């Protein structure tokens, strides 16, 4: 459980917030994300 996605439509044309949680630091980012259908991070 490595972060969250907040928004209103979870799409473009309106903004949304993204909390991702790396091994050293959290990066909160509030941009017009074109969110995918099944969002996941991808580690080696
Ligand atoms: C997480 O992000 C920071 C900066 O955004 C970066 O310095 C760090 O290396 C990243 N973590 C990993 C495991 O790559």
UniProtKB/Swiss-Prot annotation:
It comes from the Viruses. Glycans are attached at residue 22. Attaches the virion to the cell membrane by interacting with host receptor, initiating the infection. The major receptor is host ACE2. When S2/S2' has been cleaved, binding to the receptor triggers direct fusion at the cell membrane. When S2/S2' has not been cleaved, binding to the receptor results in internalization of the virus by endocytosis using host TFRC and GRM2 and leading to fusion of the virion membrane with the host endosomal membrane. Alternatively, may use NRP1/NRP2 and integrin as entry receptors. Binds to host ACE2. RBD also interacts with the N-linked glycan on 'Asn-90' of ACE2. Cleavage of S generates a polybasic C-terminal sequence on S1 that binds to host Neuropilin-1 (NRP1) and Neuropilin-2 (NRP2) receptors. Interacts with host integrin alpha-5/beta-1 (ITGA5:ITGB1) and with ACE2 in complex with integrin alpha-5/beta-1 (ITGA5:ITGB1). May interact via cytoplasmic c-terminus with M protein. May interact (via N-terminus) with host bilirubin and biliverdin, thereby preventing antibody binding to the SARS-CoV-2 spike NTD via an allosteric mechanism. This is Spike protein S1.
């Amino acid at each position: 459980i490595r972060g969250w996605i907040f928004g209103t439509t979870l799409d473009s044309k309106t903004q949304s917030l993204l909390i991702v949680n790396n091994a050293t630091n959290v990066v909160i980012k509030v941009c017009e994300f074109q969110f995918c259908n099944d969002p996941f991070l991808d580690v080696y």
